[PDB]
Amino acid sequence: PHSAFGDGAKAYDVPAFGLQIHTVEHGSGAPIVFLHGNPTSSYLWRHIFRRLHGHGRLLAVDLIGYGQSSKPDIEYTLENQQRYVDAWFDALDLRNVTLVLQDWGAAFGLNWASRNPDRVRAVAFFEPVLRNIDSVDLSPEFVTRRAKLRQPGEGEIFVQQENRFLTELFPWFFLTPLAPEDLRQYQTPFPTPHSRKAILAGPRNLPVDGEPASTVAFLEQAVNWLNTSDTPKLLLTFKPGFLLTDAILKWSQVTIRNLEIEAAGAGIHFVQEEQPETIARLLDAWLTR
Template identity: 60%
Template sequence: MSQTAPRSAHPGFGPDATSNEVAVLDSTIHWVEQGEGDPFVFLHGNPTSSFLWRKVFANLNGEGRLLAVDLIGFGDSGKPAIDYDLADHERYLDAWFDALDLRDVTLVLQDYGAAFGVSWARRNPDRVKAVALLEPVLWPIDSADLPEAFVQTRALVKRPGEGEEFVLEQNAFLTQLFPNVFLQPLPDDVLAEYLRPFPTPESRKPVIVFPRRLPVDNEPADTIALLEANAEWLASSEVPKLLLTFEPGFLLTPPILAWARETIKNLTVQEGGAGVHFVQEEEPEKVADAVKGWLPR
């Protein structure tokens, strides 16, 4: 395992957190780490990075070995010449878990990080201890349950040529759409950190894939197949699971929340406070407190 020497992480994670990098497959994966004991792995989605977890991370200091990872192509992880489809993300994430030989893992998951984290748990059931979910890509969504403005923007992103112009060339997904998915505007320095990993059209290639693969109205087929396989594990596994709800929320629509209550085994549902989608920015203390209060002891 080729791993670089740890260096100081962004101060928002806490004074003792370190920034780390390990070679996996043909690239590198970056993560922030702090503490000792059983591992907690924090997985983000689009278009963010481990940085999204910094306040939750700091509030969970002392609970174990905390690891907030950047998906391949995001944050400070490498940007290899791949398609960045769902299977690519699983391959690189699997390689990272194996490089660090992580076991007895509590997964704390949001957005596509939930789809990938549950998939990893499903395929490595002897290595997972518990799963916490917030604003997850969990089950197919009906477009009627999503804001009309988002449905229209996603349709634009899906159109060949127009999507590339909007996301890659204009950088509009990051500079127009993303900053508006918060109850309060992000400070300029925080927004700048989210924009930093994507300075060029080529660097933004990973960002366009996820909205195109979002499971809406029972397509695309590969995302639906992944979520259906995940659902079988969620319905049968005894692993403790926590699902946090937020108001108004975004991905966790009322029908999906009802499906989760009916389907997921050994599930605790708890209110997480006020937030849209990137709830780690809006309710970090409540997220951390909910995880600490629920943790299997």
């Protein structure tokens, strides 16, 4: 794996339903699992991952559709993606698990936890896909683009043929511009139109103003576990942030149980690139508690 993951980090592929889930690991102890979202991979966690050496067994995955994991010719429904995540957790048979989740990784991580409450120690998340979002609360340029992407054909042209999600939209939504070399690393998984399939499914699956209704329903499944589990939970917030809208922040304070919330400073969305030091520090103090 990449040197930025730190000394003594190894990688390997985890088989699932015929495919491969690429996995970066370091250390030993209680498992700490890092799940990315769209359109990133384990690489997004590298600086946080390295700064967290020795808290336990660090596990960062590339979801199916991303990174060095297989890119099959499936529909990237939430049900299908969840199956592969469930599979990876099965292969590794983990317990006493701390989840550290961001974007879609929050949706899949929380969904897993909710059905596996006995295997979960703690969960930290930020910029999560968590709840229905009000379009008035999101950057309008993203909302408009998403609306275009939900149109048959136009979405595939923008994301898969022209590759503009990766060449335009992705690097725009960084507070601190992303270094050339790092943008190239995020693009290496995606040489072809077909390789980019999961990238388009993301925004189409994202719940905005109630649509799609299947995603509202999928995300609702973890709500009981969130509201009633005693598992310690940590939400980091960012100014201005992106997916964590005030209404969803207020929802989480009002609905989620045993939730600590800490400001982690200036950041938009890919906050692991924006405040890796602050995040790593806040997590480290948290895991110690």
